[PDB]
Amino acid sequence: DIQMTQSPDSLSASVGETVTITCGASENIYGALNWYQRKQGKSPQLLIYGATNLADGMSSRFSGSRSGRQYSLKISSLHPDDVATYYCQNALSMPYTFGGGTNLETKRTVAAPSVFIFPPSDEQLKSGTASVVCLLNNFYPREAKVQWKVDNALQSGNSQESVTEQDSKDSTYSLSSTLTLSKADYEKHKVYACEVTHQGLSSPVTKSFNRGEC
Amino acid sequence: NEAWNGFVAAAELPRNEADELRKALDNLARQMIMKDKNWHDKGQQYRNWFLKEFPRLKSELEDNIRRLRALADGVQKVHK
Amino acid sequence: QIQLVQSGPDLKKPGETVKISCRTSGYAFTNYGVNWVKQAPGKGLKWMGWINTNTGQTTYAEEFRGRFAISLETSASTAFLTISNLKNEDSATYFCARLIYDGDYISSDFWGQGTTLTVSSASTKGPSVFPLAPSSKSTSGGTAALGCLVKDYFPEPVTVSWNSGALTSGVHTFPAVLQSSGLYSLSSVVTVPSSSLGTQTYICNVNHKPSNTKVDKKVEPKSC
């Protein structure tokens, strides 16, 4: 079977720069090579076929070239919506083996998060639990830190967070963190605060509310 | 080796012809080196000479190789 | 339009069998092949196999010879992926795609949306859906954030739209987190104009197919 060795594993570049991703075939495949673009949570889409032919409907900013057993995909002028995983594929004979994929991210200017907090709903409180949500919107770079404080006490072991895929329009990330307590524990304290650190912030930003206050 | 060499003959697969085409390329090289006195300089001039004589030979060999692999897999072909 | 529409996500127990459908439309079904691709967690794509929609010939990658079977319902322009004796490592998203060969090059030119399969001894649980109401604590520079908390479900995935898909700008539907219980939670949020909170209606449409959960939750400002 034919092995496809793709390189690099990931890279990032600024909007407007040119990007090159490469694929090595373990043997000659005579131009029978496809490139695919897979955006996060989306189906892969054909980008290049026959090593150099632009798939219908895809951007002319993408081009493919070949040197012996080495195949290259080039983006001539990176756009934010190019963030995706890119795959080469052996298309000579079955099995039509995929390369390991190359993750492409965008670089952009520092952007501080906008921070928001949400008390638990009355509906959830009814059910016996309290989830408090801290939202960090549209920041860059991806690294951000959230700390929860309840009556100014640093919390540990009672929250979960996740970060989005990079935005295909503004190249930012967003983050959601949830503090979950029992209803009983929630009613033992007044001030619920999430404290946010990020490169775009010269000191920590705190968003807080007092339980029961409108 | 026994059964499939019969299929070659039976189906008129130009297998020996392909092999002989390689041998003719091998021969062209041998004859060319002995005549020239030596060629490394310029290698590109000899590369230009050949492409001029056989502009699409390499291209068409790749075409048929891909099509033979596709046929052997039983892939469905469409036009346009 | 050319379309491949696959059956929905499924939860199965080890040893069981699953059939994944791939319903095609918008082209001569028996003129193009169909092949299947396994998407593992992370970057991996693994080509699984192919079926000739005219003859019925199939070809599988080594890894998928045993328990995987591609079949057809030509009269319905549909192809199937049947996986038998489901094993733990079968948990993945599976894609069908049309295989086009134009006489020169062979490629998967149109793809299904994918089918997410979870193989687990654990039973499904439907989410509770709670509003994340817009308030003075979720406002900034004339915009208000609001959302839905989709809590305690199994397995993935849950899908979330806003206003039946008419609201997409400014939406962030976050990757789910795995709770200690082995249940998932996720949040979906949207930023909207502060000025029209009084005139616009915001509804998160939450669908968790494995538990038949279909919830439309209206998210309103808190009143007191």
mmCIF file of N, CA and C in Angstrom, chain C residues 12-116:
data_model
loop_
_atom_site.group_PDB
_atom_site.id
_atom_site.type_symbol
_atom_site.label_atom_id
_atom_site.label_comp_id
_atom_site.label_asym_id
_atom_site.label_seq_id
_atom_site.Cartn_x
_atom_site.Cartn_y
_atom_site.Cartn_z
ATOM 1 N N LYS C 12 -24.595 2.581 20.080
ATOM 2 C CA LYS C 12 -24.716 1.132 20.011
ATOM 3 C C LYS C 12 -23.879 0.485 21.097
ATOM 4 N N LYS C 13 -24.286 -0.710 21.517
ATOM 5 C CA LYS C 13 -23.504 -1.491 22.459
ATOM 6 C C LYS C 13 -22.497 -2.340 21.700
ATOM 7 N N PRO C 14 -21.337 -2.606 22.316
ATOM 8 C CA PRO C 14 -20.364 -3.531 21.731
ATOM 9 C C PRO C 14 -21.031 -4.844 21.319
ATOM 10 N N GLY C 15 -20.641 -5.376 20.163
ATOM 11 C CA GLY C 15 -21.183 -6.630 19.679
ATOM 12 C C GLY C 15 -22.377 -6.442 18.766
ATOM 13 N N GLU C 16 -23.079 -5.323 18.922
ATOM 14 C CA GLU C 16 -24.262 -5.058 18.108
ATOM 15 C C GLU C 16 -23.883 -4.710 16.673
ATOM 16 N N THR C 17 -24.899 -4.471 15.850
ATOM 17 C CA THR C 17 -24.698 -4.112 14.449
ATOM 18 C C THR C 17 -25.331 -2.764 14.142
ATOM 19 N N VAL C 18 -24.683 -1.978 13.289
ATOM 20 C CA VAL C 18 -25.266 -0.716 12.863
ATOM 21 C C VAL C 18 -25.245 -0.608 11.340
ATOM 22 N N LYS C 19 -26.302 -0.029 10.787
ATOM 23 C CA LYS C 19 -26.355 0.242 9.364
ATOM 24 C C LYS C 19 -26.458 1.739 9.156
ATOM 25 N N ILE C 20 -25.496 2.288 8.433
ATOM 26 C CA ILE C 20 -25.475 3.715 8.177
ATOM 27 C C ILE C 20 -25.911 3.961 6.743
ATOM 28 N N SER C 21 -26.916 4.808 6.563
ATOM 29 C CA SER C 21 -27.444 5.038 5.228
ATOM 30 C C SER C 21 -26.823 6.286 4.609
ATOM 31 N N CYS C 22 -26.739 6.273 3.286
ATOM 32 C CA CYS C 22 -26.229 7.390 2.513
ATOM 33 C C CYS C 22 -27.157 7.618 1.327
ATOM 34 N N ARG C 23 -28.136 8.499 1.498
ATOM 35 C CA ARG C 23 -29.146 8.711 0.467
ATOM 36 C C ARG C 23 -28.733 9.822 -0.503
ATOM 37 N N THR C 24 -28.482 9.446 -1.753
ATOM 38 C CA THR C 24 -28.024 10.403 -2.752
ATOM 39 C C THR C 24 -29.169 10.918 -3.616
ATOM 40 N N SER C 25 -28.958 12.092 -4.202
ATOM 41 C CA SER C 25 -29.936 12.718 -5.083
ATOM 42 C C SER C 25 -29.254 13.757 -5.967
ATOM 43 N N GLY C 26 -29.801 13.977 -7.162
ATOM 44 C CA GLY C 26 -29.339 15.058 -8.019
ATOM 45 C C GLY C 26 -28.365 14.652 -9.108
ATOM 46 N N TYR C 27 -28.210 13.347 -9.306
ATOM 47 C CA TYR C 27 -27.331 12.825 -10.346
ATOM 48 C C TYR C 27 -27.656 11.359 -10.594
ATOM 49 N N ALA C 28 -27.150 10.814 -11.700
ATOM 50 C CA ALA C 28 -27.329 9.398 -12.015
ATOM 51 C C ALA C 28 -26.553 8.518 -11.034
ATOM 52 N N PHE C 29 -27.264 7.975 -10.050
ATOM 53 C CA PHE C 29 -26.659 7.208 -8.960
ATOM 54 C C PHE C 29 -25.725 6.082 -9.423
ATOM 55 N N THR C 30 -26.092 5.405 -10.501
ATOM 56 C CA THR C 30 -25.339 4.234 -10.937
ATOM 57 C C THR C 30 -24.202 4.571 -11.903
ATOM 58 N N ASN C 31 -23.882 5.855 -12.048
ATOM 59 C CA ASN C 31 -22.763 6.265 -12.895
ATOM 60 C C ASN C 31 -21.514 6.610 -12.089
ATOM 61 N N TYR C 32 -21.678 6.740 -10.777
ATOM 62 C CA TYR C 32 -20.566 7.084 -9.906
ATOM 63 C C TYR C 32 -20.464 6.104 -8.755
ATOM 64 N N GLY C 33 -19.254 5.937 -8.241
ATOM 65 C CA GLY C 33 -19.042 5.038 -7.130
ATOM 66 C C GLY C 33 -19.408 5.710 -5.820
ATOM 67 N N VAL C 34 -19.365 4.938 -4.747
ATOM 68 C CA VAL C 34 -19.490 5.493 -3.410
ATOM 69 C C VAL C 34 -18.380 4.912 -2.558
ATOM 70 N N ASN C 35 -17.632 5.762 -1.862
ATOM 71 C CA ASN C 35 -16.698 5.231 -0.884
ATOM 72 C C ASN C 35 -16.893 5.877 0.479
ATOM 73 N N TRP C 36 -16.364 5.201 1.487
ATOM 74 C CA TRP C 36 -16.594 5.567 2.866
ATOM 75 C C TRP C 36 -15.267 5.872 3.535
ATOM 76 N N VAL C 37 -15.309 6.834 4.449
ATOM 77 C CA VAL C 37 -14.131 7.346 5.138
ATOM 78 C C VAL C 37 -14.410 7.424 6.634
ATOM 79 N N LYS C 38 -13.454 6.961 7.432
ATOM 80 C CA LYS C 38 -13.581 6.985 8.878
ATOM 81 C C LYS C 38 -12.796 8.145 9.444
ATOM 82 N N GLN C 39 -13.492 9.004 10.173
ATOM 83 C CA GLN C 39 -12.842 10.112 10.833
ATOM 84 C C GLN C 39 -12.628 9.774 12.296
ATOM 85 N N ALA C 40 -11.371 9.556 12.658
ATOM 86 C CA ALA C 40 -10.992 9.310 14.039
ATOM 87 C C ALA C 40 -10.862 10.629 14.798
ATOM 88 N N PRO C 41 -10.849 10.561 16.137
ATOM 89 C CA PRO C 41 -10.647 11.751 16.973
ATOM 90 C C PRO C 41 -9.353 12.485 16.610
ATOM 91 N N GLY C 42 -9.451 13.785 16.346
ATOM 92 C CA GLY C 42 -8.295 14.554 15.926
ATOM 93 C C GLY C 42 -8.273 14.790 14.425
ATOM 94 N N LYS C 43 -7.120 14.560 13.802
ATOM 95 C CA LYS C 43 -6.933 14.864 12.383
ATOM 96 C C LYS C 43 -7.234 13.698 11.447
ATOM 97 N N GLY C 44 -7.109 12.472 11.948
ATOM 98 C CA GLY C 44 -7.105 11.297 11.086
ATOM 99 C C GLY C 44 -8.294 11.092 10.159
ATOM 100 N N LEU C 45 -8.008 10.891 8.868
ATOM 101 C CA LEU C 45 -8.985 10.341 7.924
ATOM 102 C C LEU C 45 -8.479 9.003 7.408
ATOM 103 N N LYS C 46 -9.315 7.976 7.511
ATOM 104 C CA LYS C 46 -8.970 6.658 6.998
ATOM 105 C C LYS C 46 -9.952 6.214 5.921
ATOM 106 N N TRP C 47 -9.438 6.029 4.709
ATOM 107 C CA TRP C 47 -10.236 5.505 3.617
ATOM 108 C C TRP C 47 -10.663 4.081 3.965
ATOM 109 N N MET C 48 -11.959 3.788 3.884
ATOM 110 C CA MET C 48 -12.443 2.471 4.307
ATOM 111 C C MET C 48 -12.661 1.492 3.156
ATOM 112 N N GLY C 49 -13.366 1.937 2.123
ATOM 113 C CA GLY C 49 -13.694 1.052 1.026
ATOM 114 C C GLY C 49 -14.610 1.717 0.028
ATOM 115 N N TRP C 50 -14.955 0.961 -1.003
ATOM 116 C CA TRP C 50 -15.640 1.490 -2.167
ATOM 117 C C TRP C 50 -16.627 0.465 -2.696
ATOM 118 N N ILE C 51 -17.718 0.939 -3.289
ATOM 119 C CA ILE C 51 -18.635 0.051 -3.985
ATOM 120 C C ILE C 51 -18.961 0.600 -5.371
ATOM 121 N N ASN C 52 -18.986 -0.303 -6.348
ATOM 122 C CA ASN C 52 -19.400 0.010 -7.703
ATOM 123 C C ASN C 52 -20.923 0.000 -7.777
ATOM 124 N N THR C 53 -21.519 1.165 -8.009
ATOM 125 C CA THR C 53 -22.974 1.295 -7.985
ATOM 126 C C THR C 53 -23.640 0.639 -9.200
ATOM 127 N N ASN C 54 -22.834 0.206 -10.161
ATOM 128 C CA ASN C 54 -23.368 -0.463 -11.342
ATOM 129 C C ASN C 54 -23.271 -1.977 -11.214
ATOM 130 N N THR C 55 -22.096 -2.465 -10.826
ATOM 131 C CA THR C 55 -21.849 -3.902 -10.778
ATOM 132 C C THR C 55 -22.058 -4.474 -9.382
ATOM 133 N N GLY C 56 -21.717 -3.691 -8.365
ATOM 134 C CA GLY C 56 -21.857 -4.140 -6.995
ATOM 135 C C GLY C 56 -20.552 -4.635 -6.401
ATOM 136 N N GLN C 57 -19.470 -4.516 -7.165
ATOM 137 C CA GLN C 57 -18.145 -4.857 -6.662
ATOM 138 C C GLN C 57 -17.740 -3.951 -5.497
ATOM 139 N N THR C 58 -17.156 -4.552 -4.465
ATOM 140 C CA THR C 58 -16.657 -3.792 -3.331
ATOM 141 C C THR C 58 -15.175 -4.059 -3.127
ATOM 142 N N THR C 59 -14.499 -3.076 -2.548
ATOM 143 C CA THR C 59 -13.091 -3.176 -2.209
ATOM 144 C C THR C 59 -12.855 -2.463 -0.884
ATOM 145 N N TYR C 60 -12.180 -3.137 0.038
ATOM 146 C CA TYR C 60 -11.963 -2.585 1.371
ATOM 147 C C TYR C 60 -10.480 -2.447 1.670
ATOM 148 N N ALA C 61 -10.119 -1.420 2.430
ATOM 149 C CA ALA C 61 -8.774 -1.335 2.985
ATOM 150 C C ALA C 61 -8.593 -2.495 3.953
ATOM 151 N N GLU C 62 -7.348 -2.929 4.145
ATOM 152 C CA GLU C 62 -7.038 -4.080 4.994
ATOM 153 C C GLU C 62 -7.712 -3.998 6.356
ATOM 154 N N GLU C 63 -7.638 -2.816 6.954
ATOM 155 C CA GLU C 63 -8.124 -2.578 8.306
ATOM 156 C C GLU C 63 -9.624 -2.820 8.450
ATOM 157 N N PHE C 64 -10.347 -2.796 7.333
ATOM 158 C CA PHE C 64 -11.805 -2.842 7.381
ATOM 159 C C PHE C 64 -12.406 -4.029 6.635
ATOM 160 N N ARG C 65 -11.595 -5.055 6.392
ATOM 161 C CA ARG C 65 -12.058 -6.245 5.678
ATOM 162 C C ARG C 65 -13.125 -7.017 6.447
ATOM 163 N N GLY C 66 -12.814 -7.367 7.691
ATOM 164 C CA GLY C 66 -13.669 -8.226 8.486
ATOM 165 C C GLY C 66 -15.123 -7.815 8.636
ATOM 166 N N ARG C 67 -15.369 -6.785 9.432
ATOM 167 C CA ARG C 67 -16.719 -6.526 9.924
ATOM 168 C C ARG C 67 -17.492 -5.446 9.165
ATOM 169 N N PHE C 68 -16.924 -4.949 8.071
ATOM 170 C CA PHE C 68 -17.529 -3.833 7.352
ATOM 171 C C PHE C 68 -18.097 -4.244 6.003
ATOM 172 N N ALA C 69 -19.315 -3.802 5.720
ATOM 173 C CA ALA C 69 -19.975 -4.186 4.483
ATOM 174 C C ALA C 69 -20.695 -3.009 3.842
ATOM 175 N N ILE C 70 -20.356 -2.732 2.587
ATOM 176 C CA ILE C 70 -21.035 -1.696 1.824
ATOM 177 C C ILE C 70 -22.066 -2.337 0.909
ATOM 178 N N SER C 71 -23.272 -1.784 0.895
ATOM 179 C CA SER C 71 -24.340 -2.328 0.068
ATOM 180 C C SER C 71 -25.124 -1.206 -0.597
ATOM 181 N N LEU C 72 -26.133 -1.592 -1.375
ATOM 182 C CA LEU C 72 -26.892 -0.655 -2.194
ATOM 183 C C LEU C 72 -28.397 -0.857 -2.108
ATOM 184 N N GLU C 73 -29.131 0.233 -2.300
ATOM 185 C CA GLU C 73 -30.537 0.166 -2.672
ATOM 186 C C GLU C 73 -30.715 1.076 -3.880
ATOM 187 N N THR C 74 -30.415 0.530 -5.056
ATOM 188 C CA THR C 74 -30.336 1.298 -6.295
ATOM 189 C C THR C 74 -31.624 2.053 -6.609
ATOM 190 N N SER C 75 -32.752 1.423 -6.304
ATOM 191 C CA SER C 75 -34.063 2.006 -6.552
ATOM 192 C C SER C 75 -34.311 3.247 -5.702
ATOM 193 N N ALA C 76 -33.527 3.403 -4.640
ATOM 194 C CA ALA C 76 -33.663 4.551 -3.755
ATOM 195 C C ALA C 76 -32.431 5.449 -3.817
ATOM 196 N N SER C 77 -31.531 5.154 -4.756
ATOM 197 C CA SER C 77 -30.272 5.887 -4.918
ATOM 198 C C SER C 77 -29.524 5.996 -3.594
ATOM 199 N N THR C 78 -29.460 4.878 -2.879
ATOM 200 C CA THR C 78 -28.917 4.858 -1.529
ATOM 201 C C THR C 78 -27.846 3.788 -1.369
ATOM 202 N N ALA C 79 -26.784 4.132 -0.646
ATOM 203 C CA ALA C 79 -25.749 3.171 -0.287
ATOM 204 C C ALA C 79 -25.714 3.026 1.230
ATOM 205 N N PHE C 80 -25.269 1.869 1.712
ATOM 206 C CA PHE C 80 -25.261 1.588 3.145
ATOM 207 C C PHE C 80 -23.891 1.140 3.604
ATOM 208 N N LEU C 81 -23.561 1.503 4.836
ATOM 209 C CA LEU C 81 -22.386 0.976 5.511
ATOM 210 C C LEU C 81 -22.846 0.204 6.733
ATOM 211 N N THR C 82 -22.688 -1.115 6.688
ATOM 212 C CA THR C 82 -23.066 -1.958 7.807
ATOM 213 C C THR C 82 -21.821 -2.439 8.537
ATOM 214 N N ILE C 83 -21.765 -2.162 9.831
ATOM 215 C CA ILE C 83 -20.659 -2.608 10.665
ATOM 216 C C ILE C 83 -21.197 -3.606 11.671
ATOM 217 N N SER C 84 -20.671 -4.823 11.638
ATOM 218 C CA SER C 84 -21.152 -5.881 12.516
ATOM 219 C C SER C 84 -20.213 -6.094 13.693
ATOM 220 N N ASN C 85 -20.738 -6.722 14.747
ATOM 221 C CA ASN C 85 -19.943 -7.071 15.916
ATOM 222 C C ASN C 85 -19.209 -5.845 16.448
ATOM 223 N N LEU C 86 -19.961 -4.764 16.638
ATOM 224 C CA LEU C 86 -19.383 -3.459 16.949
ATOM 225 C C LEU C 86 -18.396 -3.543 18.096
ATOM 226 N N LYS C 87 -17.233 -2.946 17.881
ATOM 227 C CA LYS C 87 -16.178 -2.976 18.871
ATOM 228 C C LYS C 87 -15.916 -1.569 19.356
ATOM 229 N N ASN C 88 -15.199 -1.477 20.463
ATOM 230 C CA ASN C 88 -14.981 -0.213 21.141
ATOM 231 C C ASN C 88 -14.377 0.856 20.231
ATOM 232 N N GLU C 89 -13.476 0.430 19.354
ATOM 233 C CA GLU C 89 -12.708 1.341 18.512
ATOM 234 C C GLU C 89 -13.481 1.773 17.267
ATOM 235 N N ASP C 90 -14.727 1.330 17.158
ATOM 236 C CA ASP C 90 -15.560 1.732 16.036
ATOM 237 C C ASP C 90 -16.188 3.115 16.261
ATOM 238 N N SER C 91 -16.059 3.659 17.469
ATOM 239 C CA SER C 91 -16.583 5.000 17.742
ATOM 240 C C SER C 91 -15.866 6.032 16.882
ATOM 241 N N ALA C 92 -16.611 6.678 15.993
ATOM 242 C CA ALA C 92 -16.038 7.619 15.038
ATOM 243 C C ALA C 92 -17.146 8.309 14.279
ATOM 244 N N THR C 93 -16.764 9.254 13.433
ATOM 245 C CA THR C 93 -17.710 9.830 12.505
ATOM 246 C C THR C 93 -17.429 9.200 11.148
ATOM 247 N N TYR C 94 -18.471 8.696 10.496
ATOM 248 C CA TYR C 94 -18.294 8.053 9.202
ATOM 249 C C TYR C 94 -18.866 8.901 8.079
ATOM 250 N N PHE C 95 -18.104 9.023 6.993
ATOM 251 C CA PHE C 95 -18.511 9.817 5.843
ATOM 252 C C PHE C 95 -18.694 8.931 4.620
ATOM 253 N N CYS C 96 -19.786 9.149 3.898
ATOM 254 C CA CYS C 96 -19.905 8.615 2.555
ATOM 255 C C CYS C 96 -19.562 9.745 1.588
ATOM 256 N N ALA C 97 -19.049 9.393 0.419
ATOM 257 C CA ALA C 97 -18.758 10.392 -0.596
ATOM 258 C C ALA C 97 -18.857 9.762 -1.974
ATOM 259 N N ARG C 98 -19.327 10.537 -2.945
ATOM 260 C CA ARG C 98 -19.364 10.058 -4.320
ATOM 261 C C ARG C 98 -17.950 9.925 -4.850
ATOM 262 N N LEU C 99 -17.706 8.858 -5.605
ATOM 263 C CA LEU C 99 -16.421 8.679 -6.268
ATOM 264 C C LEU C 99 -16.589 8.934 -7.756
ATOM 265 N N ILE C 100 -15.933 9.984 -8.240
ATOM 266 C CA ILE C 100 -15.969 10.325 -9.654
ATOM 267 C C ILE C 100 -14.646 9.984 -10.329
ATOM 268 N N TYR C 101 -14.744 9.371 -11.503
ATOM 269 C CA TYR C 101 -13.582 9.089 -12.333
ATOM 270 C C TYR C 101 -13.867 9.620 -13.733
ATOM 271 N N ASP C 102 -13.130 10.645 -14.145
ATOM 272 C CA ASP C 102 -13.441 11.349 -15.389
ATOM 273 C C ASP C 102 -12.613 10.844 -16.569
ATOM 274 N N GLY C 103 -11.997 9.677 -16.401
ATOM 275 C CA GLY C 103 -11.161 9.103 -17.441
ATOM 276 C C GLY C 103 -9.695 9.378 -17.176
ATOM 277 N N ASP C 104 -9.424 10.344 -16.302
ATOM 278 C CA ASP C 104 -8.052 10.686 -15.946
ATOM 279 C C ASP C 104 -7.784 10.590 -14.454
ATOM 280 N N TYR C 105 -8.650 11.210 -13.660
ATOM 281 C CA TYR C 105 -8.418 11.291 -12.225
ATOM 282 C C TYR C 105 -9.623 10.831 -11.409
ATOM 283 N N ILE C 106 -9.333 10.311 -10.223
ATOM 284 C CA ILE C 106 -10.340 9.709 -9.364
ATOM 285 C C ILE C 106 -10.406 10.469 -8.052
ATOM 286 N N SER C 107 -11.596 10.904 -7.668
ATOM 287 C CA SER C 107 -11.711 11.660 -6.421
ATOM 288 C C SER C 107 -13.086 11.573 -5.783
ATOM 289 N N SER C 108 -13.133 11.896 -4.495
ATOM 290 C CA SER C 108 -14.393 12.030 -3.780
ATOM 291 C C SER C 108 -14.881 13.472 -3.916
ATOM 292 N N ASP C 109 -15.778 13.726 -4.867
ATOM 293 C CA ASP C 109 -16.104 15.106 -5.221
ATOM 294 C C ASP C 109 -17.301 15.664 -4.442
ATOM 295 N N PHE C 110 -18.175 14.788 -3.959
ATOM 296 C CA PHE C 110 -19.292 15.224 -3.115
ATOM 297 C C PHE C 110 -19.418 14.303 -1.910
ATOM 298 N N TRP C 111 -19.607 14.903 -0.733
ATOM 299 C CA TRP C 111 -19.581 14.190 0.544
ATOM 300 C C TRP C 111 -20.906 14.260 1.317
ATOM 301 N N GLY C 112 -21.240 13.191 2.031
ATOM 302 C CA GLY C 112 -22.319 13.248 3.007
ATOM 303 C C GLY C 112 -21.920 14.119 4.190
ATOM 304 N N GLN C 113 -22.850 14.362 5.115
ATOM 305 C CA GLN C 113 -22.565 15.239 6.256
ATOM 306 C C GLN C 113 -21.875 14.466 7.375
ATOM 307 N N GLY C 114 -21.797 13.149 7.236
ATOM 308 C CA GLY C 114 -21.167 12.350 8.262
ATOM 309 C C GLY C 114 -22.164 11.827 9.277
ATOM 310 N N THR C 115 -21.828 10.682 9.848
ATOM 311 C CA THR C 115 -22.651 10.018 10.839
ATOM 312 C C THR C 115 -21.790 9.665 12.048
ATOM 313 N N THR C 116 -22.138 10.202 13.214
ATOM 314 C CA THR C 116 -21.335 9.957 14.403
ATOM 315 C C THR C 116 -21.847 8.763 15.202
#
